[PDB]
Amino acid sequence: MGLYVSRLFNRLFQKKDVRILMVGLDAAGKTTILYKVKLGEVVTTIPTIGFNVETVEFRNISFTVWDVGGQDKIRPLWRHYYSNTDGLIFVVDSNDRERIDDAREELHRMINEEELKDAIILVFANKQDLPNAMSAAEVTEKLHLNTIRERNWFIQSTCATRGDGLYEGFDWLTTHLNNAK
Ligand SMILES: Nc1nc2c(ncn2[C@@H]2O[C@H](COP(=O)(O)OP(=O)(O)O)[C@@H](O)[C@H]2O)c(=O)[nH]1
Ligand SMILES: [Mg+2]
C-alpha cells in the first residue's frame, strides 16, 4: 500500500520541494490517512499549547496536517504553513451532516488565501463505508465545489480505515502537481 502510493510521488523528483497541506475539521479522518499510506514517520509537534500538527516527510515531499474549524480565532496561526504550498488536501467526514457546512466554509476560506491561490485541490470524501454517509455527489453539493473557478480540483471517495480511494486520490494529485509549474 504505502509502496504503491510512495511510487506515485517519484513523479515529482525534479521538484525542489513539494509542499502538501492536509486539513479538515477534527474527526474527518486526516490522522488515519497518514498512518494508512505509511509514507514516513508521523512526527507530531505542538507549535503552541493546544495546536497540534502532524508532519510526514520523505524525499523532497512533505505533508503538514492540522485540524481546521476549531476555535476560529487561531486561524491566523495556520498562515505559517501557506507559503509555497503546492497542493491542498481537504479531508471531509461524509457521514457528518451536522458539520459539513463548517467544512465548506473552512475549505472555501482556505483556498482563497492569497498564498494558496495556485494550490491543486484534492478533496477526500471520507467514511464512504458508513451506511448513512452522503454520497460523493451530495458532499460535492454541500461543499459547493462546483463554485470553484480557475482552480484544478477533484473529489475522491475514500474509506481511510481500509485505504480505498487513497491511491486514486494521490494518483490524481501527484499527476497534476507534476505538470503544475
Ligand atoms: N467508519 C469510518 N471511520 C473512519 C474512517 N476514517 C477514519 N475513521 C474514524 O474516524 C475518527 C477520525 O480520526 P482521525 O484520527 O482519523 O481524525 P482527524 O485526524 O481529526 O481527522 C477515528 O475514530 C477513525 O477511526 C472511515 O473511512 N470510516
Ligand atoms: Mg488528527
From Swiss-Prot:
It is a lipid-anchor. Keywords: ER-Golgi transport, Golgi apparatus, GTP-binding, Hydrolase, Lipoprotein, Membrane, Myristate, Nucleotide-binding, Protein transport, Transport. The keyword Translocase does not apply. Pfam families: Arf (PF00025). InterPro entries: Arf1-5-like, P-loop_NTPase, Small_GTP-bd, Small_GTPase_ARF, Small_GTPase_ARF/SAR. Its EC number is 3.6.5.2. GTP binds at G24, L25, D26, A27, A28, G29, K30, T31, N126, K127, Q128, D129, A160. GO terms for molecular function: GTP binding; GTPase activity. Alternates between an inactive GDP-bound form and an active GTP-bound form. Intrinsic GTPase activity is almost undetectable in vitro. Activated by a guanine nucleotide-exchange factor (GEF) and inactivated by GTPase-activating protein ARFGAP1. One of its GO terms (cellular component) is Golgi membrane. It comes from the Eukaryota. GO terms for biological process: protein transport; vesicle-mediated transport. A lipid is attached at G2 (N-myristoyl glycine). Signal peptide: none annotated. Its main location: Golgi. It is found in: Golgi apparatus membrane. It catalyses: GTP + H2O = GDP + phosphate + H(+). It is an enzyme of class 3 (hydrolase). The keyword Ribosomal protein does not apply. CDD domains: Arf1_5_like (cd04150). May interact with GTPase RAB5b. PANTHER family: ADP RIBOSYLATION FACTOR-RELATED. Small GTPase involved in protein trafficking between different compartments. Modulates vesicle budding and uncoating within the Golgi complex. In its GTP-bound form, triggers the recruitment of coatomer proteins to the Golgi membrane. The hydrolysis of ARF1-bound GTP, which is mediated by ARFGAPs proteins, is required for dissociation of coat proteins from Golgi membranes and vesicles. Regulates the transport of N-acylated AK2 to the parasitophorous vacuole membrane. May be involved in the activation of lipid kinase PIP5K. Belongs to the small GTPase superfamily. Arf family. This is ADP-ribosylation factor 1. The lineage of its organism: Eukaryota, Sar, Alveolata, Apicomplexa, Aconoidasida. The gene is ARF1.
